[PDB]
Symmetry: C6
Subunit: 217 residues, 6 copies
């Protein structure tokens, strides 16, 4: 990574090992995406490729990630056309999509783009593309849909809310659609007892009020 006088560091064994263990244990659970970002703070494309390629197994998801990264690289290419000509002594060459992904750019070039003034944060751009692919994978590997989360007859409300917001965290929808799902399905798909209790509260009750209301049930 690069940390602040900015200097370049090699990726630590604790970081890489921690990421490998995260993929081994949690597979592709939503919390993997924050952890990944946390473990890639200030990373060069070389460090990002290091983290991705250090994963054994799950090669279907890693190939999908490759294809997503390729799409984003092509979009960057058509959106940023490269200008032909010799680079000046005090200038950097324009990065291609494959240069953002650390495929066709050396570590020195990445340090150059990231640190030198008028910069291009290639590491955070690549990280953005990676996170897009990771969210697509998280969608694909979520078994349940939010529309099928229903409270059991004897299920405590709290556990049902845990399931609901886990599945909702796995759903691929904008925050307004998520807001609608909380607005409708949560109270809609509760068992009749808690459903009546919550319906009596009014359409503007917080989750704390709702959980306190049905905690005895």
């Amino acid at each position: 990574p690069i940390v602040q006088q900015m200097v370049h560091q090699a990726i630590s064994p604790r970081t890489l090992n921690a990421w490998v263990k995260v993929v081994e244990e949690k597979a592709f659970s939503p919390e993997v995406i924050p952890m990944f970002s946390a473990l890639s703070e200030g990373a060069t494309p070389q460090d990002l490729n290091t983290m991705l390629n250090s994963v054994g197994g799950h090669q279907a998801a890693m190939q999908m990630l490759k294809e997503t990264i390729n799409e984003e690289a092509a979009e960057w290419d058509r959106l940023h056309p490269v200008h032909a000509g010799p680079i000046a002594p005090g200038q950097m060459r324009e990065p291609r999509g494959s240069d953002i992904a650390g495929i066709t750019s050396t570590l020195q070039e990445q340090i150059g783009w990231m640190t030198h003034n008028a910069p291009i944060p290639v590491g955070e751009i690549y990280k953005r593309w990676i996170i897009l692919g990771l969210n697509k994978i998280v969608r694909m590997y979520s078994p349940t849909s939010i529309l099928d989360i229903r409270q059991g007859p004897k299920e405590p409300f709290r556990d049902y809310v845990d399931r609901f917001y886990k599945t909702l965290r796995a759903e691929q929808a904008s925050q307004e659609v998520k807001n609608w799902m909380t607005e409708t399905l949560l109270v809609q798909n509760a068992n009749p007892d808690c459903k009546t209790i919550l319906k009596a509260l009014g359409p503007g009750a917080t989750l704390e009020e709702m959980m306190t209301a049905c905690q005895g049930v």
Copy 2:
């Protein structure tokens, strides 16, 4: 985090892993709140969101935390109205509530608000809101009330005090109300033997005197 010449560091694997393990092991026990603060010392909103989002499961509590943070952000908004206009070259833009929570503010902007003179410690404000939500969760997940802690007939006084001050630590009440609870319930709800022994001591005996008095019982 940011540590003192102030410099910005990435969050360490030991810190994040330690927090994840703390939530996995202790669930939402009161001691989680100090640990959290200890693990968030000098953190930017990005690090705080990193710690919160790295938690799998307990998504009901995490959603409640989101709603609490939203309330505090709205209060900050109405209390700090944003002034329209272009920001000067040597000035920072006024942070909104969503900027305090790291939702709508970049890492660079957070470094700017935290370090630059005439500062706004957005990390400690966000941390304050988070701790409010965490205390609400700790209340909700405490099964017992302080009014029901009663010493058993053969229960040693020391264990009863452990239960009493654990449950009391989970109670949501001001320090004066807590002082009243220690003043009344502790001696009130002991078994008749220790109750008589303590009643003989006088209304101004320390906990050490009380525990030494009933340690034989």
Copy 3:
């Protein structure tokens, strides 16, 4: 903590985790007090409160510690009366007892008192009070008294000395009283064989001479 150009650091996960594990494993054994001090070297009151509050369970002892700290704070208050008036631009405000314990003083104020010339080491004062309370707890949780340590008929002398100086380490008495206890009880409460062997040595034999004399027995 603060370490030497003096700079302020956040408390490390290894330190806090190590302390939590120390309390979990050793409960309130005497060696906990050195370890604590070792883990609090150069700590601010915020770090000390962090270590104390990160302890789950043992809430009777933690409450006793709170009461001891309150007593010491009151003594500091009556011994150091606060002078009313506005603080000068280049001066610190006088710390109250609650400011020493990190209850009513910010981290910035603690850094100020500890680092600025003509200093007040509030961290080491608070640490002193904490250690007083910890010694009181160690007394209360010691089951045996030094007067009851007696060598068994077939017990090797070495194990009896281990028990004797463990219990003695738990005793609350000045070093002169401890010197008297070593002078009298150790030889007094040995089994008749080793008791005769030691009595033949003279009143001025070292522990090495005494243990070598009875190692065959």
Copy 4:
């Protein structure tokens, strides 16, 4: 290693231990090669030889690695003929192939070549040769060929893709040949149900479309 003011560090116990454990656990799986590179970032030839020689067992593969490194060293020799003569006071001696591999060059000489201006990155050259040998080993120890990966009658498509791209990751072929293998064999060697489903999609469907199409099957 050497990290950026560039300074020379000794190899850390976490790095060497991590590499030894990687070879012990994963044998010669493809992900070993990225990890190795990650653990050798900025390494001198002494550190590379340290990592290679610290491996017990697998001595057939380590000998093959030695022979590959010898071939690359001979090629460097014939491609870079050494010029006879005394080295100037402010100049470095021309490195031989055995000097790149850390066999006949001191640590001081390696620091000299790597740091001094007009440099020769001997560590990354040696690392390149090592990675060539490692890829040859990875080929030799891959049991299956890509031409034999066939979906089972009841095998979910996702697992079949995992096998396919694992074996493909082990294959020694250019990226164009790999592109042809994905273009032909993946759809070719699926079971008739998924084979028909995929054939209906068209010759230009992404892996995400293909996996979503057959996830019910």
Copy 5:
């Protein structure tokens, strides 16, 4: 500790934990003394007392260590008489024996004696006394004497040499006496087969020659 611009550091959790585990696992085996020294490199008397007092159990040995340290302190006192008078502004006070052992000297005073020019390395003096006591303990807790190590009839020579030099490492004797013990007892107390084989070699054979000679036996 203090490490080189010399600066004072707090003792690390890895060091203290490592020492505690060393005493827990190895009790008082000879290798404990090097480890201790390694873990106390550049330590102040506060760090040394920290390591010693962090040991639970073995309180007989720790008390013996206290008595040894007291003897050495008294010898330092009579050998270095303190001169009465006020200390100059740029001078240190003369350290007493109790000041060397960190009993009656603050951390600041220890830093002063150790760092300031014309220094007194109180940490290494205290460490020397501690190591004297530790060697006395190692003698006391060694069960066997070197005079009783005898090779079994079917015991391989190598194991007998392991026992011999372990027990010899535990013996309290000068290096000339140890040289005599190797010169006499090793060949003297071997079984008749190896005894004849070694006697044929001559009085000037190395341990390698001796072990190679009897490795078939």
Copy 6:
């Protein structure tokens, strides 16, 4: 150790613990020698003696190591005769053999010889002697000879090569003799099937060609 502005550090707990565990687990396997060197990079004689003396058990091998180091010290003595006279203010005293081994030289003197211009790297000289003794031990504790490694009738070629180059790694012979052993015994001592297959390849086939040729067998 000493690391580059050169500064002296204390040996880390991870390094010493790692070495102790290496000896405990691998005994005296060849890979111990690289690891040792890796863990002693930039070490003073005090650190080397620290690593050697921290080893419990294996005291026959450690005594042999002592005797080897003594031989090398005597050779250094006769090869470097000490010149009598007083040392100048800006000069170092000539190191004896016992000074190289950290027996009769303080840490300060070792820092002096290693850092001061016109230096004598006493740490790397001592390390060289130690490695000589370690190689002698590795020879003595290798049970098999290279002349007895023979492929089984049903043994895969790859495992036989593993045994062959392990035993060969344990052999004490120059690289030309090793080259002859690979040239003759490897093909000589294979089973008749693989022996014929390899004999058909020609006297100039690489190990990769040989292993690929017999991998079906």
